[PDB]
Design a protein around this ligand. Structure first.
Ligand SMILES: *C(=O)/C=C/c1ccc(O)cc1
Length: 125
């Protein structure tokens, strides 16, 4: 396991340019999205939490097809506000319930250092 904590102040630096295998070593779920919500990276911890196959979701749109329960002001709305300003950094609890047992989580979305890239981190509560 990579020694990185959820919510760490410099998480975007420690995860900067991490390959898919390194991301698979985290204690929490980690998704990377482009500014439209298309999935660029998706780690093993997230797949174990949600049931999605980390290999199959790459290239799908998170808000339109994988996670319609997040297509709301409280998730997607906050995401796109932070994309537009270039300073996305919000941590909030949420329930994931599309074609799955409703699963309550803490979400941390934060701008990544790479261009047109935004992290969504997820742990259970
Ligand atoms: C609501 O539809 C949430 C779905 C979901 C959240 C997070 C994932 O990694 C996959 C699906």
């Amino acid at each position: 396991m990579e020694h990185v904590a959820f919510g760490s102040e410099d998480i975007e630096n420690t995860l900067a340019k991490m390959d898919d295998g390194q991301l698979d070593g985290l204690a929490f779920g980690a998704i990377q999205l482009d500014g439209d919500g298309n999935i660029l990276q998706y780690n093993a911890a997230e797949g174990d939490t949600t049931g999605r196959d980390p290999k199959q979701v790459i290239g799908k749109n998170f808000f339109k097809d994988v996670a319609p329960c997040t297509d709301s002001p409280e998730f997607y709305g906050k995401f796109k506000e932070g994309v537009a300003s270039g300073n996305l950094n919000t941590m909030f609890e949420y329930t994931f319930d599309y074609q799955m047992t409703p699963t309550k989580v803490k979400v941390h979305m934060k701008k990544a250092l790479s261009g047109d890239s935004y992290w969504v981190f997820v742990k259970r509560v």
